[PDB]
Symmetry: C6
Subunit: 92 residues, 6 copies
Protein backbone atom coordinates (compact mmCIF):
# COMPACT_ATOMS: atom_id res chain seq x y z
CA UNK A 1 0.00 0.00 0.00
CA UNK A 2 1.54 3.28 -1.07
CA UNK A 3 -0.74 5.98 0.43
CA UNK A 4 1.13 8.48 2.64
CA UNK A 5 -0.05 9.93 5.94
CA UNK A 6 1.85 12.74 7.68
CA UNK A 7 1.49 14.56 10.94
CA UNK A 8 3.61 17.55 11.97
CA UNK A 9 3.83 18.68 15.56
CA UNK A 10 5.56 21.32 17.71
CA UNK A 11 7.98 19.16 19.62
CA UNK A 12 8.75 15.47 19.75
CA UNK A 13 6.33 14.36 22.47
CA UNK A 14 3.14 15.05 20.45
CA UNK A 15 4.83 13.42 17.40
CA UNK A 16 5.39 10.19 19.35
CA UNK A 17 1.74 10.25 20.51
CA UNK A 18 0.64 10.82 16.89
CA UNK A 19 2.81 7.88 15.72
CA UNK A 20 1.31 5.61 18.39
CA UNK A 21 -2.29 6.61 17.67
CA UNK A 22 -1.75 6.28 13.88
CA UNK A 23 -0.16 2.84 14.07
CA UNK A 24 -2.83 1.53 16.53
CA UNK A 25 -5.71 2.92 14.41
CA UNK A 26 -5.13 0.99 11.18
CA UNK A 27 -2.60 -1.14 9.33
CA UNK A 28 0.08 1.42 8.52
CA UNK A 29 3.87 1.31 8.67
CA UNK A 30 5.81 4.08 10.39
CA UNK A 31 8.43 5.02 7.82
CA UNK A 32 10.02 8.09 9.41
CA UNK A 33 10.24 10.70 12.11
CA UNK A 34 12.02 13.87 10.97
CA UNK A 35 13.40 16.69 13.03
CA UNK A 36 12.63 19.53 10.65
CA UNK A 37 14.19 22.48 12.44
CA UNK A 38 12.72 25.23 14.61
CA UNK A 39 10.99 22.56 16.78
CA UNK A 40 8.80 21.04 14.06
CA UNK A 41 8.72 17.26 14.02
CA UNK A 42 7.05 15.19 11.26
CA UNK A 43 5.98 11.55 11.41
CA UNK A 44 5.26 9.63 8.21
CA UNK A 45 3.23 6.45 7.64
CA UNK A 46 2.48 4.32 4.57
CA UNK A 47 -0.38 1.93 3.89
CA UNK A 48 -3.52 1.38 1.84
CA UNK A 49 -5.71 4.48 1.35
CA UNK A 50 -8.45 3.49 3.76
CA UNK A 51 -5.90 2.55 6.46
CA UNK A 52 -4.00 5.86 6.03
CA UNK A 53 -7.29 7.91 6.21
CA UNK A 54 -8.18 6.20 9.52
CA UNK A 55 -4.62 6.51 10.89
CA UNK A 56 -4.12 10.20 10.17
CA UNK A 57 -7.53 11.03 11.64
CA UNK A 58 -6.73 9.10 14.85
CA UNK A 59 -3.23 10.66 15.13
CA UNK A 60 -4.51 14.26 14.70
CA UNK A 61 -7.20 13.76 17.42
CA UNK A 62 -4.64 12.22 19.78
CA UNK A 63 -1.67 14.59 19.46
CA UNK A 64 -3.70 17.86 19.45
CA UNK A 65 -3.84 17.81 23.26
CA UNK A 66 -0.20 16.85 23.93
CA UNK A 67 2.56 19.42 24.56
CA UNK A 68 2.67 22.26 22.03
CA UNK A 69 0.31 20.26 19.84
CA UNK A 70 -0.57 19.80 16.19
CA UNK A 71 0.64 21.70 13.11
CA UNK A 72 -0.51 19.61 10.14
CA UNK A 73 -2.35 16.39 9.36
CA UNK A 74 -2.38 15.49 5.70
CA UNK A 75 -2.84 12.53 3.36
CA UNK A 76 -1.56 11.92 -0.14
CA UNK A 77 -3.11 8.70 -1.46
CA UNK A 78 -0.63 8.26 -4.36
CA UNK A 79 2.49 10.45 -4.42
CA UNK A 80 4.23 11.02 -7.71
CA UNK A 81 7.16 8.59 -8.18
CA UNK A 82 9.50 11.68 -7.97
CA UNK A 83 8.31 12.29 -4.41
CA UNK A 84 9.39 8.77 -3.33
CA UNK A 85 12.99 10.08 -3.58
CA UNK A 86 12.51 12.40 -0.56
CA UNK A 87 10.42 9.96 1.59
CA UNK A 88 12.22 7.79 4.15
CA UNK A 89 11.83 4.07 3.64
CA UNK A 90 12.76 3.04 7.21
CA UNK A 91 12.91 5.01 10.41
CA UNK A 92 16.00 5.53 12.54
CA UNK B 1 15.71 21.36 -19.24
CA UNK B 2 17.51 23.64 -16.83
CA UNK B 3 14.81 25.99 -15.47
CA UNK B 4 14.56 25.97 -11.65
CA UNK B 5 11.39 26.03 -9.57
CA UNK B 6 11.50 26.45 -5.78
CA UNK B 7 8.94 26.43 -3.05
CA UNK B 8 9.70 27.23 0.60
CA UNK B 9 7.33 26.27 3.38
CA UNK B 10 7.04 26.45 7.18
CA UNK B 11 7.45 22.81 8.07
CA UNK B 12 7.96 19.63 6.11
CA UNK B 13 4.34 18.58 5.54
CA UNK B 14 3.46 21.52 3.23
CA UNK B 15 6.83 20.98 1.43
CA UNK B 16 5.90 17.36 0.63
CA UNK B 17 2.49 18.51 -0.65
CA UNK B 18 4.22 21.16 -2.79
CA UNK B 19 6.63 18.53 -4.19
CA UNK B 20 3.72 16.22 -5.06
CA UNK B 21 1.64 18.95 -6.70
CA UNK B 22 4.67 20.27 -8.65
CA UNK B 23 5.72 16.86 -9.97
CA UNK B 24 2.11 15.91 -10.94
CA UNK B 25 1.52 19.27 -12.69
CA UNK B 26 4.22 19.10 -15.37
CA UNK B 27 7.35 17.23 -16.41
CA UNK B 28 9.79 18.33 -13.73
CA UNK B 29 12.40 16.46 -11.70
CA UNK B 30 12.55 16.84 -7.93
CA UNK B 31 16.20 17.59 -7.29
CA UNK B 32 16.19 18.42 -3.58
CA UNK B 33 14.42 19.00 -0.30
CA UNK B 34 16.46 21.12 2.12
CA UNK B 35 15.97 21.64 5.81
CA UNK B 36 17.04 25.26 6.01
CA UNK B 37 16.87 25.91 9.74
CA UNK B 38 14.27 27.62 11.91
CA UNK B 39 11.54 25.36 10.39
CA UNK B 40 11.91 26.51 6.78
CA UNK B 41 11.92 23.72 4.23
CA UNK B 42 12.69 24.23 0.50
CA UNK B 43 11.86 21.90 -2.38
CA UNK B 44 13.61 22.31 -5.73
CA UNK B 45 12.60 21.11 -9.21
CA UNK B 46 14.24 21.31 -12.65
CA UNK B 47 12.70 21.13 -16.10
CA UNK B 48 11.89 23.12 -19.23
CA UNK B 49 10.63 26.68 -18.62
CA UNK B 50 6.99 26.03 -19.44
CA UNK B 51 6.94 22.87 -17.27
CA UNK B 52 8.56 24.71 -14.30
CA UNK B 53 6.05 27.66 -14.61
CA UNK B 54 3.13 25.19 -14.45
CA UNK B 55 4.71 23.16 -11.62
CA UNK B 56 5.53 26.05 -9.31
CA UNK B 57 2.05 27.53 -9.79
CA UNK B 58 0.41 24.18 -8.93
CA UNK B 59 2.68 23.63 -5.89
CA UNK B 60 2.03 27.13 -4.43
CA UNK B 61 -1.79 26.67 -4.75
CA UNK B 62 -1.59 23.23 -3.14
CA UNK B 63 0.72 23.83 -0.17
CA UNK B 64 -0.76 27.21 0.89
CA UNK B 65 -3.52 25.42 2.82
CA UNK B 66 -1.38 22.73 4.48
CA UNK B 67 0.12 23.11 7.98
CA UNK B 68 1.93 26.41 8.56
CA UNK B 69 1.80 27.01 4.81
CA UNK B 70 3.73 28.81 2.11
CA UNK B 71 6.73 31.16 2.36
CA UNK B 72 8.01 31.52 -1.20
CA UNK B 73 7.27 30.30 -4.72
CA UNK B 74 9.83 31.38 -7.28
CA UNK B 75 11.17 30.48 -10.72
CA UNK B 76 14.54 31.11 -12.30
CA UNK B 77 14.40 30.02 -15.95
CA UNK B 78 18.21 29.95 -16.46
CA UNK B 79 20.46 30.21 -13.39
CA UNK B 80 23.99 31.42 -13.84
CA UNK B 81 26.44 28.48 -14.13
CA UNK B 82 27.93 29.65 -10.74
CA UNK B 83 24.58 28.95 -9.08
CA UNK B 84 24.64 25.29 -10.24
CA UNK B 85 27.37 24.77 -7.60
CA UNK B 86 24.89 25.30 -4.72
CA UNK B 87 21.92 23.37 -6.29
CA UNK B 88 21.44 19.71 -5.39
CA UNK B 89 21.57 17.32 -8.33
CA UNK B 90 19.74 14.42 -6.61
CA UNK B 91 17.59 14.32 -3.52
CA UNK B 92 18.31 12.28 -0.40
CA UNK C 1 8.70 -3.22 31.42
CA UNK C 2 7.75 -1.47 28.21
CA UNK C 3 5.69 1.57 29.31
CA UNK C 4 7.07 4.89 27.99
CA UNK C 5 7.33 8.17 29.88
CA UNK C 6 8.34 11.40 28.14
CA UNK C 7 8.99 14.92 29.26
CA UNK C 8 9.70 17.81 26.89
CA UNK C 9 11.26 21.03 28.11
CA UNK C 10 12.44 24.41 26.79
CA UNK C 11 16.17 24.02 27.14
CA UNK C 12 18.45 21.31 28.43
CA UNK C 13 18.68 22.29 32.11
CA UNK C 14 15.01 21.53 32.93
CA UNK C 15 15.33 18.27 30.90
CA UNK C 16 18.24 17.11 33.09
CA UNK C 17 16.22 17.96 36.23
CA UNK C 18 13.25 16.03 34.80
CA UNK C 19 15.50 13.02 34.06
CA UNK C 20 16.89 13.08 37.62
CA UNK C 21 13.48 13.40 39.27
CA UNK C 22 11.99 10.66 37.04
CA UNK C 23 14.79 8.17 37.67
CA UNK C 24 14.79 8.84 41.47
CA UNK C 25 10.98 8.53 41.69
CA UNK C 26 10.54 4.94 40.48
CA UNK C 27 12.33 2.08 38.74
CA UNK C 28 12.65 3.45 35.22
CA UNK C 29 15.49 3.42 32.70
CA UNK C 30 16.54 6.61 30.94
CA UNK C 31 16.62 5.59 27.30
CA UNK C 32 17.21 8.93 25.56
CA UNK C 33 17.62 12.67 25.61
CA UNK C 34 16.85 14.28 22.24
CA UNK C 35 17.65 17.74 21.03
CA UNK C 36 14.55 18.33 18.94
CA UNK C 37 15.28 21.71 17.40
CA UNK C 38 14.13 25.22 18.27
CA UNK C 39 15.27 24.66 21.91
CA UNK C 40 12.94 21.76 22.71
CA UNK C 41 14.57 18.89 24.55
CA UNK C 42 12.85 15.53 25.24
CA UNK C 43 13.82 12.90 27.80
CA UNK C 44 12.46 9.36 27.51
CA UNK C 45 12.16 6.62 30.15
CA UNK C 46 10.95 3.00 30.06
CA UNK C 47 9.63 0.80 32.83
CA UNK C 48 6.54 -0.93 34.20
CA UNK C 49 3.31 1.11 33.99
CA UNK C 50 3.08 1.99 37.67
CA UNK C 51 6.77 3.02 37.77
CA UNK C 52 6.40 5.21 34.63
CA UNK C 53 3.21 6.91 36.05
CA UNK C 54 5.12 7.81 39.25
CA UNK C 55 8.25 8.90 37.35
CA UNK C 56 6.55 11.19 34.85
CA UNK C 57 4.52 12.83 37.62
CA UNK C 58 7.68 13.48 39.69
CA UNK C 59 9.62 14.80 36.65
CA UNK C 60 6.85 17.24 35.60
CA UNK C 61 6.60 18.69 39.17
CA UNK C 62 10.38 19.05 39.37
CA UNK C 63 11.25 20.59 35.99
CA UNK C 64 8.32 23.06 35.84
CA UNK C 65 10.27 25.54 37.99
CA UNK C 66 13.66 25.21 36.26
CA UNK C 67 14.81 27.52 33.44
CA UNK C 68 12.25 28.00 30.66
CA UNK C 69 10.30 25.08 32.10
CA UNK C 70 7.94 22.35 30.99
CA UNK C 71 6.30 21.73 27.60
CA UNK C 72 4.85 18.22 27.82
CA UNK C 73 4.58 15.31 30.23
CA UNK C 74 3.01 12.22 28.73
CA UNK C 75 2.78 8.46 29.22
CA UNK C 76 2.11 5.68 26.75
CA UNK C 77 1.76 2.40 28.67
CA UNK C 78 2.19 0.14 25.59
CA UNK C 79 3.39 1.70 22.33
CA UNK C 80 2.63 -0.05 19.10
CA UNK C 81 5.57 -2.23 17.96
CA UNK C 82 5.95 0.20 14.96
CA UNK C 83 6.72 3.02 17.39
CA UNK C 84 9.67 1.07 18.90
CA UNK C 85 11.51 1.84 15.62
CA UNK C 86 11.72 5.59 16.46
CA UNK C 87 12.48 5.19 20.23
CA UNK C 88 16.11 5.22 21.36
CA UNK C 89 17.26 2.08 23.14
CA UNK C 90 20.28 3.65 24.89
CA UNK C 91 21.20 7.24 25.55
CA UNK C 92 24.32 8.99 24.27
CA UNK D 1 40.13 39.50 -7.06
CA UNK D 2 39.70 39.25 -3.32
CA UNK D 3 36.78 41.60 -2.49
CA UNK D 4 33.94 39.87 -0.60
CA UNK D 5 30.22 40.35 -1.14
CA UNK D 6 27.64 38.82 1.21
CA UNK D 7 23.90 38.66 1.29
CA UNK D 8 21.88 37.17 4.16
CA UNK D 9 18.26 36.20 3.75
CA UNK D 10 15.39 34.66 5.73
CA UNK D 11 15.11 31.31 4.03
CA UNK D 12 16.88 29.61 1.17
CA UNK D 13 14.70 30.75 -1.75
CA UNK D 14 15.66 34.45 -1.52
CA UNK D 15 19.33 33.38 -1.04
CA UNK D 16 19.27 31.45 -4.34
CA UNK D 17 17.71 34.48 -6.09
CA UNK D 18 20.41 36.71 -4.55
CA UNK D 19 23.15 34.31 -5.75
CA UNK D 20 21.71 34.30 -9.28
CA UNK D 21 21.33 38.08 -9.47
CA UNK D 22 24.85 38.63 -8.02
CA UNK D 23 26.56 36.22 -10.41
CA UNK D 24 24.67 37.61 -13.47
CA UNK D 25 25.43 41.23 -12.50
CA UNK D 26 29.23 41.16 -12.60
CA UNK D 27 32.22 38.83 -12.73
CA UNK D 28 32.08 37.27 -9.27
CA UNK D 29 32.55 33.71 -8.04
CA UNK D 30 30.01 32.13 -5.70
CA UNK D 31 32.17 30.73 -2.92
CA UNK D 32 29.55 29.60 -0.40
CA UNK D 33 25.99 29.27 0.78
CA UNK D 34 25.72 28.79 4.55
CA UNK D 35 22.79 27.64 6.59
CA UNK D 36 23.37 29.79 9.65
CA UNK D 37 20.63 28.58 11.98
CA UNK D 38 17.23 30.01 12.87
CA UNK D 39 16.38 30.26 9.12
CA UNK D 40 19.15 32.69 8.15
CA UNK D 41 20.97 31.80 4.96
CA UNK D 42 24.12 33.61 3.72
CA UNK D 43 25.58 33.61 0.22
CA UNK D 44 29.17 34.72 -0.36
CA UNK D 45 30.89 35.93 -3.55
CA UNK D 46 34.46 36.98 -4.37
CA UNK D 47 35.78 39.19 -7.14
CA UNK D 48 37.37 42.55 -7.93
CA UNK D 49 35.99 45.51 -5.93
CA UNK D 50 33.98 47.06 -8.74
CA UNK D 51 32.46 43.67 -9.68
CA UNK D 52 31.52 42.91 -6.03
CA UNK D 53 29.91 46.41 -5.60
CA UNK D 54 27.74 45.80 -8.69
CA UNK D 55 26.91 42.21 -7.68
CA UNK D 56 25.85 42.91 -4.11
CA UNK D 57 23.68 45.83 -5.25
CA UNK D 58 21.94 43.64 -7.87
CA UNK D 59 21.45 40.75 -5.40
CA UNK D 60 19.92 42.98 -2.67
CA UNK D 61 17.42 44.52 -5.17
CA UNK D 62 16.48 41.08 -6.47
CA UNK D 63 16.04 39.05 -3.27
CA UNK D 64 14.20 41.77 -1.26
CA UNK D 65 10.90 40.75 -2.89
CA UNK D 66 11.30 36.96 -2.64
CA UNK D 67 9.93 34.90 0.28
CA UNK D 68 10.77 36.28 3.72
CA UNK D 69 13.29 38.59 2.06
CA UNK D 70 16.54 40.35 2.83
CA UNK D 71 18.47 40.64 6.10
CA UNK D 72 21.88 42.04 5.12
CA UNK D 73 23.83 43.13 2.06
CA UNK D 74 27.43 44.01 2.77
CA UNK D 75 30.81 44.36 1.06
CA UNK D 76 34.32 44.06 2.42
CA UNK D 77 36.78 45.04 -0.31
CA UNK D 78 39.86 43.50 1.40
CA UNK D 79 39.31 41.22 4.40
CA UNK D 80 42.14 40.74 6.84
CA UNK D 81 44.13 37.56 6.06
CA UNK D 82 42.81 36.15 9.42
CA UNK D 83 39.26 36.34 8.07
CA UNK D 84 40.16 34.11 5.07
CA UNK D 85 40.28 31.22 7.59
CA UNK D 86 36.48 31.37 8.15
CA UNK D 87 35.49 32.02 4.47
CA UNK D 88 34.56 29.05 2.28
CA UNK D 89 36.73 28.59 -0.79
CA UNK D 90 34.26 26.42 -2.75
CA UNK D 91 30.57 25.84 -2.33
CA UNK D 92 28.92 22.50 -1.62
CA UNK E 1 33.12 14.91 43.60
CA UNK E 2 29.93 14.13 41.72
CA UNK E 3 27.67 17.17 42.29
CA UNK E 4 26.45 18.78 39.04
CA UNK E 5 26.15 22.49 38.31
CA UNK E 6 24.48 23.77 35.13
CA UNK E 7 23.94 27.14 33.60
CA UNK E 8 21.88 27.76 30.46
CA UNK E 9 22.18 30.97 28.48
CA UNK E 10 20.79 32.62 25.34
CA UNK E 11 23.83 32.51 23.11
CA UNK E 12 27.37 31.29 23.49
CA UNK E 13 29.05 34.45 24.82
CA UNK E 14 27.21 34.46 28.18
CA UNK E 15 27.83 30.67 28.43
CA UNK E 16 31.61 31.20 28.12
CA UNK E 17 31.45 33.93 30.80
CA UNK E 18 29.44 31.57 33.04
CA UNK E 19 32.02 28.79 32.50
CA UNK E 20 34.88 31.16 33.39
CA UNK E 21 33.18 32.54 36.51
CA UNK E 22 32.17 29.02 37.67
CA UNK E 23 35.63 27.53 37.23
CA UNK E 24 37.35 30.53 38.94
CA UNK E 25 34.88 30.49 41.87
CA UNK E 26 35.55 27.00 43.24
CA UNK E 27 37.21 23.68 42.43
CA UNK E 28 34.94 22.39 39.68
CA UNK E 29 35.64 20.67 36.37
CA UNK E 30 34.01 21.90 33.17
CA UNK E 31 32.58 18.74 31.67
CA UNK E 32 30.57 20.10 28.74
CA UNK E 33 29.19 22.94 26.69
CA UNK E 34 26.11 21.95 24.67
CA UNK E 35 24.47 23.75 21.81
CA UNK E 36 20.88 22.86 22.59
CA UNK E 37 19.05 24.37 19.64
CA UNK E 38 17.10 27.61 19.23
CA UNK E 39 20.10 29.57 20.65
CA UNK E 40 20.18 27.94 24.08
CA UNK E 41 23.63 26.97 25.29
CA UNK E 42 24.29 24.91 28.46
CA UNK E 43 27.54 24.61 30.40
CA UNK E 44 28.02 21.77 32.89
CA UNK E 45 30.45 21.44 35.81
CA UNK E 46 31.18 18.67 38.33
CA UNK E 47 32.71 18.86 41.78
CA UNK E 48 32.02 18.50 45.50
CA UNK E 49 28.67 19.93 46.67
CA UNK E 50 30.07 23.02 48.37
CA UNK E 51 32.29 23.82 45.35
CA UNK E 52 29.36 23.40 42.90
CA UNK E 53 27.07 25.66 45.07
CA UNK E 54 29.72 28.42 45.01
CA UNK E 55 30.45 27.95 41.29
CA UNK E 56 26.87 28.05 40.05
CA UNK E 57 26.15 31.14 42.16
CA UNK E 58 29.22 32.94 40.75
CA UNK E 59 28.39 31.91 37.15
CA UNK E 60 24.74 33.09 37.36
CA UNK E 61 25.81 36.53 38.74
CA UNK E 62 28.45 36.89 36.04
CA UNK E 63 26.58 35.82 32.89
CA UNK E 64 23.28 37.62 33.69
CA UNK E 65 24.70 40.87 32.28
CA UNK E 66 26.35 39.45 29.15
CA UNK E 67 24.61 39.31 25.74
CA UNK E 68 21.09 37.88 25.82
CA UNK E 69 21.79 36.65 29.35
CA UNK E 70 20.75 33.89 31.71
CA UNK E 71 18.05 31.22 31.34
CA UNK E 72 18.72 28.74 34.15
CA UNK E 73 21.14 28.14 37.01
CA UNK E 74 20.62 24.84 38.78
CA UNK E 75 22.42 22.34 41.00
CA UNK E 76 21.89 18.63 41.48
CA UNK E 77 24.14 17.43 44.30
CA UNK E 78 23.84 13.69 43.45
CA UNK E 79 22.25 12.71 40.12
CA UNK E 80 20.78 9.27 39.78
CA UNK E 81 23.26 6.84 38.15
CA UNK E 82 20.84 6.70 35.13
CA UNK E 83 21.40 10.41 34.54
CA UNK E 84 25.19 9.89 34.21
CA UNK E 85 24.41 8.30 30.81
CA UNK E 86 23.31 11.66 29.32
CA UNK E 87 26.05 13.83 30.98
CA UNK E 88 29.23 14.56 29.03
CA UNK E 89 32.42 13.35 30.68
CA UNK E 90 34.80 15.64 28.74
CA UNK E 91 34.18 18.77 26.74
CA UNK E 92 34.93 19.21 23.05
CA UNK F 1 48.83 36.27 24.36
CA UNK F 2 45.91 34.49 25.96
CA UNK F 3 43.22 37.19 26.39
CA UNK F 4 39.88 36.28 24.75
CA UNK F 5 37.60 38.59 22.80
CA UNK F 6 34.13 37.48 21.66
CA UNK F 7 31.40 39.02 19.61
CA UNK F 8 27.97 37.44 19.09
CA UNK F 9 25.68 38.55 16.30
CA UNK F 10 22.27 37.75 14.81
CA UNK F 11 23.29 36.16 11.55
CA UNK F 12 26.59 35.45 9.85
CA UNK F 13 27.06 38.68 7.89
CA UNK F 14 27.53 40.93 10.96
CA UNK F 15 29.83 38.23 12.46
CA UNK F 16 32.12 38.37 9.41
CA UNK F 17 32.19 42.19 9.64
CA UNK F 18 33.02 41.92 13.36
CA UNK F 19 35.84 39.44 12.60
CA UNK F 20 37.28 41.77 9.94
CA UNK F 21 37.10 44.88 12.13
CA UNK F 22 38.59 43.00 15.14
CA UNK F 23 41.51 41.55 13.19
CA UNK F 24 42.29 44.91 11.47
CA UNK F 25 42.11 46.84 14.77
CA UNK F 26 44.90 45.11 16.70
CA UNK F 27 47.15 42.05 16.69
CA UNK F 28 44.65 39.30 17.43
CA UNK F 29 44.17 35.82 16.00
CA UNK F 30 40.74 34.66 14.85
CA UNK F 31 40.36 31.31 16.56
CA UNK F 32 36.74 30.44 15.76
CA UNK F 33 33.37 31.24 14.27
CA UNK F 34 30.55 29.20 15.82
CA UNK F 35 27.04 28.69 14.59
CA UNK F 36 25.29 28.58 17.94
CA UNK F 37 21.72 27.81 16.93
CA UNK F 38 18.65 30.00 16.53
CA UNK F 39 20.66 32.37 14.25
CA UNK F 40 23.28 33.40 16.80
CA UNK F 41 26.83 33.43 15.50
CA UNK F 42 29.92 33.95 17.70
CA UNK F 43 33.41 34.96 16.61
CA UNK F 44 36.37 34.45 18.95
CA UNK F 45 39.81 36.10 18.96
CA UNK F 46 42.93 35.66 21.12
CA UNK F 47 45.78 38.05 21.80
CA UNK F 48 47.43 40.24 24.43
CA UNK F 49 45.01 42.13 26.71
CA UNK F 50 45.51 45.55 25.16
CA UNK F 51 45.13 44.14 21.63
CA UNK F 52 41.92 42.25 22.57
CA UNK F 53 40.42 45.41 24.25
CA UNK F 54 41.03 47.41 21.04
CA UNK F 55 39.79 44.60 18.77
CA UNK F 56 36.52 43.91 20.57
CA UNK F 57 35.73 47.63 20.73
CA UNK F 58 36.35 48.02 16.97
CA UNK F 59 34.30 44.89 16.12
CA UNK F 60 31.27 45.97 18.23
CA UNK F 61 31.21 49.45 16.57
CA UNK F 62 31.50 47.91 13.11
CA UNK F 63 28.97 45.05 13.26
CA UNK F 64 26.22 46.97 15.13
CA UNK F 65 25.01 48.48 11.84
CA UNK F 66 25.17 45.32 9.70
CA UNK F 67 22.17 43.00 9.16
CA UNK F 68 20.35 42.02 12.35
CA UNK F 69 23.29 43.40 14.32
CA UNK F 70 25.05 42.90 17.63
CA UNK F 71 24.14 40.68 20.59
CA UNK F 72 27.24 40.64 22.80
CA UNK F 73 30.76 42.05 22.93
CA UNK F 74 32.83 40.74 25.80
CA UNK F 75 36.43 40.29 26.91
CA UNK F 76 37.99 37.82 29.31
CA UNK F 77 41.65 38.74 29.81
CA UNK F 78 42.67 35.37 31.35
CA UNK F 79 40.21 32.47 31.16
CA UNK F 80 40.53 29.66 33.64
CA UNK F 81 42.54 26.74 32.20
CA UNK F 82 39.26 24.67 32.36
CA UNK F 83 37.67 27.07 29.88
CA UNK F 84 40.44 26.42 27.30
CA UNK F 85 38.80 22.99 26.79
CA UNK F 86 35.69 24.55 25.17
CA UNK F 87 37.55 27.25 23.10
CA UNK F 88 38.45 26.48 19.49
CA UNK F 89 42.16 26.61 18.71
CA UNK F 90 41.79 27.03 14.92
CA UNK F 91 38.86 28.07 12.80
CA UNK F 92 37.23 25.96 10.10
Amino acid sequence: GIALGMIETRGLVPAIEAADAMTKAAEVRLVGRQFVGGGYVTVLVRGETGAVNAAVRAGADACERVGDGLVAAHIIARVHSEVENILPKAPQ
